[PDB]
């Protein structure tokens, strides 16, 4: 499964945020428009996409920009059906319970911001922005969207920017 | 002085009643294992209650 | 089953209340915060947890305290689905009927206060605080929580602090 | 024999006097009422028995208290028939001669106060309170009771509180 | 070697400092007089030695007391010959270099205060009082004595009381 998830993430145009030769994060295109975590500095690893001017959203520490329709051709597919269970992402699985996403300890660190969370159908259900040490596991700070289109950001108390 | 003493007794009784009401309100405000009790504070609003 | 219940209770950080070398009760962490029966005197068998200041609740004879998030990592999972049937706890099974928990006679005594009641999934459904002789069985005084979050304490008439 | 003596002492409710986790003595129940050496500080190792209020007797450095009849059910059996010979107690045998109890050297020390002396029938004949170095043996300071009910305390000159 | 070191430490009268049933440190007798780290609370595990009144030395956080000559019969042998190399102590070996004692990381923790350091001849060369995390190793705070009889305490910067 993880192999297929990585293949889908690579085939879909996704590009890390390079700064001085260091990967400081990741950015992806979902719903035909690029999003980028505002706290991560640098430029997208795509000259064509870098030409797009982004808008800032301080409240969520996220940025967004318009993507040309011809490049909107193949982007991430979002869904609002988020039942309890387990999902998959770049660094393995993620447990969803009580409305929160949690992963085993030692998974995720500074520079992983921007990795989306995929369901069994390969649809995006959340975007990982950070995390905080949670003993045997760690809880990720993510943003998710309900069927009504409301943006909700779940941030654990004293969450670290990962 | 009689009026002042009566007023003081009234204030003390009101304070005691408020303290007992706060204790009664905190009774459901115990651990109640969820670590989350917004709704009891939002409904009862006894004092220092739901932020939202 | 009882083996798995004991293994889950031991793996999850649970500590008896020691006083002068005598086990006078038990305390556990559910939902990421420690609870302790107020009538039981002594200190938790954990120096790190003992550092936490508790708050009193005379109405239910219970205490509570905040647990650090890093230690909140692995605590008991509570559920509100409490159908009639049988559940499991440290000293065997418990019968749930008419909204009351009952166990066979000779099970439970002074010093068992604090033992939780687990379902088939290992989720906590009630906390045992005491009991009273009920002939061929004994009825335990427990606290349970509905899906609305209301704390309800069921106490048999003339129940003894066990 | 010593095995049976220890089994009888354990089956009968006997409890050492614990202070700060250290065994400073022993106390037992004979004739349905608890006795305790006054010079030994601490509380009996039984919460139910600890609830009993004791009375002091400075003359013999002993304390006594009333035991509930239901707990008087099984206590030590005393006898006044104390012929010369050998008896048994926790740390082996004891020689009775000239009205005095003596044991081999190296047997008994500080913290053994309260150990009774049993006959061949398991009946108590004396209570050990102390002792004094007597060369190849040591002489114990004990209290014994005649058939007339007179309390007589035999204390060697310069006896040490053991 | 470690076996012989433990045998020598046990045969020589050494007693941990017990408080509420917990080992909070260790104390030993060297040169015929007892020493105890002042920061460690509790009483020596020896009633006869506990009868000795100690004197305080705040500067080194150490205590000392006079031991009866008959008990001075068998104490630790101190030497001033402290060449560079490796020595042995309760938790294995210790490296001596640049006038400082160092041991591999994970060796030593709160409650080990009082353990002496022995040479190949079983003679004491230093007393371990604390330590501080030093990466792959840890540096112990110790006191040593030169051939002129000068007490010198080596304490790493920000050393923790272990």
Closest chain C residue to B34, measured at CA: C31
d(CA A96, CA A120): 13
Contact at 8 Å (CB) between B9 and B1? no
B9's enclosing H/E stretch is: helix B2-26
Contact at 8 Å (CB) between A158 and C69? yes
Comparing CA positions, the residue from E108, E110, E128 lying closest to residue E37 is E128
Q: Considering A61, A88, A119, A141, which one is annotated as catalytic? A: A61
d(CA D54, CA D16): 16
d(CA A55, CA A37): 11
Q: Is A104 on the interface with C (CB under 8 A)?
A: no
Comparing CA positions, the residue from E39, E34, E2 lying closest to residue E155 is E39
d(CA D138, CA D116): 16
CB contact under 8 Å between C70 and A133, yes or no, is yes
Contact at 8 Å (CB) between D63 and D35? yes
D44's enclosing H/E stretch is: strand D43-44
Contact at 8 Å (CB) between A29 and A67? yes
Paired strand residues for E116: E127
Sheet holding D62-66, edge to edge: D43-44, D15-19, D22-30, D33-37, D62-66, D54-57
Please name the chains neighbouring A, where neighbouring means 3+ C-beta pairs under 8 angstroms: C
CB contact under 8 Å between C69 and A137, yes or no, is no
Please tell me whether residue E5 adopts helix, strand or coil conformation.
helix
C30: CB partners within 8 A, 6+ apart: B31, B33, C75, C76, C78, C116, C124
Q: What DSSP character marks residue B12?
A: H
d(CA B31, CA C56): 10
Q: Which residues of C touch D18 (CB under 8 A)?
A: 20-21
Paired strand residues for D107: none
Strand positions, DSSP E, A39-99: 43-44, 54-57, 62-66, 85-89, 92-97
d(CA C118, CA A49): 54
d(CA E18, CA E11): 19
User: What Å resolution does this PDB entry report?
Assistant: 4.3
Pure H helices in chain D: 2-11, 47-50, 69-72
Q: Considering D88, D90, D113, D119, which one is annotated as catalytic? A: D113
d(CA A145, CA A112): 21
Interface list for D 3-32 with E (CB within 8 A): 20-21
Closest chain C residue to A138, measured at CA: C73
C-alpha torsion angle, residues E77, E81, E84, E90 (rounded to 10): 0
A36's enclosing H/E stretch is: strand A33-37
Write the DSSP assignment of B13-49 as a string of letters: HHHHHHHHHHHHHHTTTS-TTTS--HHHHHHH--SS-
User: How many A-C residue pairs are in contact by the CB < 8 A criterion?
Assistant: 18
Q: Considering A112, A113, A119, A141, which one is annotated as catalytic? A: A113
Please name the chains neighbouring C, where neighbouring means 3+ C-beta pairs under 8 angstroms: A, B, D
Contact at 8 Å (CB) between D45 and D23? no
Contact at 8 Å (CB) between E90 and E115? yes
Strands C15-19 and C22-30, by their bridges, are antiparallel
Please name the chains neighbouring E, where neighbouring means 3+ C-beta pairs under 8 angstroms: D
Write the DSSP assignment of E93-124 as a string of letters: EEEEETTEEEEETT---TT-TT-EEE-TTS-E
Please tell me whether residue E57 adopts helix, strand or coil conformation.
strand
Contact at 8 Å (CB) between A108 and A162? yes
Contact at 8 Å (CB) between D38 and D56? yes
C11 is catalytic: no
d(CA D9, CA D127): 13
Q: Which residues of C touch A134 (CB under 8 A)?
A: 69-70, 72-73
- Residue E118, judged by CB atoms within 10 A of its CB (0-12, 13-18, 19+), counts as buried
Experimental technique used?
Answer: cryo-EM
Give, in order, the Cα–Cα distances in Å from C40 to each of C25, C162, D75: 6, 10, 30
Comparing CA positions, the residue from C5, C59, C65 lying closest to residue C31 is C65
For an interface test with D, the pick among E42, E45, E46, E47 (most D C-beta atoms closer than 10 Å) comes out as E47
Residue D117: count of CB within 10 angstroms of its CB:
24
Paired strand residues for D101: D96
CB contact under 8 Å between C73 and A137, yes or no, is yes
> Nearest Cβ partner of E47 from D20, D21, D110?
D110
d(CA C112, CA C117): 12
Contact at 8 Å (CB) between C26 and C115? yes
Sheet holding A22-30, edge to edge: A43-44, A15-19, A22-30, A33-37, A62-66, A54-57
Long-range contacts of A82-88 (CB under 8 A, 24+ apart): A82/A125, A82/A126, A82/A144, A87/A117, A87/A118, A87/A119, A87/A120, A87/A125, A87/A126, A88/A1, A88/A2, A88/A5, A88/A117, A88/A118, A88/A119, A88/A120
Please tell me whether residue A2 adopts helix, strand or coil conformation.
helix
* Side-chain-facing half-sphere of E155: CA atoms under 13 Å: 14
> Nearest Cβ partner of C62 from B24, B30, B34?
B30
Please tell me whether residue A37 adopts helix, strand or coil conformation.
strand
Residues present in chain C in total = 162
Q: Considering D12, D39, D45, D91, which one is annotated as catalytic? A: D39
Please tell me whether residue A45 adopts helix, strand or coil conformation.
coil
């Amino acid at each position: 499964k993880r192999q297929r998830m990585v293949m889908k993430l690579e085939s879909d145009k996704t590009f890390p945020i390079m700064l001085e030769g260091k990967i400081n994060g990741y950015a992806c295109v979902v719903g035909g428009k690029l999003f980028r975590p505002m706290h991560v500095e640098g430029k997208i690893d795509n000259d064509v996409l870098a030409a797009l001017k982004t808008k800032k959203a301080s409240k969520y520490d996220l940025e967004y920009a318009d993507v040309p329709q011809n490049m909107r051709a193949d982007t991430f597919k979002y869904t609002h059906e988020k039942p309890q269970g387990y999902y998959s992402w770049h660094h393995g699985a993620v447990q969803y319970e009580n409305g929160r996403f949690t992963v085993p300890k030692g998974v995720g660190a500074k520079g992983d911001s921007g990795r989306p969370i995929l369901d069994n159908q390969g649809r995006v259900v959340a975007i990982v922005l950070g995390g905080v040490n949670e003993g045997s596991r760690t809880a990720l700070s993510v943003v998710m969207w309900n069927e009504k289109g409301v943006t909700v950001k779940y941030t654990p108390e004293n969450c670290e920017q990962w | 002085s009689i009026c002042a003493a009566i007023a003081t007794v009234s204030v003390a009784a009101s304070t005691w009643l408020f303290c007992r009401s706060r204790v009664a309100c905190l009774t459901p405000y115990r651990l109640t294992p969820n670590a989350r009790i917004p709704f009891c504070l939002a409904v009862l609003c006894c004092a220092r209650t739901a932020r939202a």
